[PDB]
Amino acid sequence: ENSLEIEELARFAVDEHNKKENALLEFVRVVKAKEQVVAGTMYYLTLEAKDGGKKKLYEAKVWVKPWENFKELQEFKPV
C-alpha cells in the first residue's frame, strides 16, 4: 500500500523536522515521492505544509529499515 506508506513517511518527516528544529509546521499532503532501494529504502518526498498558516512546499529525504523499528529524517528544506 505504497501511497499509504508514503503519507505516513511524509507526516513523519514533518514531525521529525518540528521536533528537531523546534518548529510547528502543519502537514497538509504529499505531492511527489520517489522510493529508492539502497541499504534499506530512501524516500525523496515533496510535501505541502503550513508555516504559520501559509502553505509552503518542502522537500524531505527519509531513510527506512523495514526489518526493524527504524526511520530517519536526513534532510528537510523549503522548495
Numbering used by the authors: 32 to 110
Report text from the authors:
The overall structure comprises the characteristic cystatin family fold of a four-strand anti-parallel β-sheet core with a central helix.
Amino acids 1–10 and 90–92 are not visible in the electron density maps presumably as they are disordered. The Adhiron structure is compact with limited unstructured loops and this is consistent with the very high melting temperature of this consensus protein. The thermal stability of the Adhiron92 and Adhiron81 scaffolds was tested by DSC and both gave identical profiles with a melting temperature of 101°C.
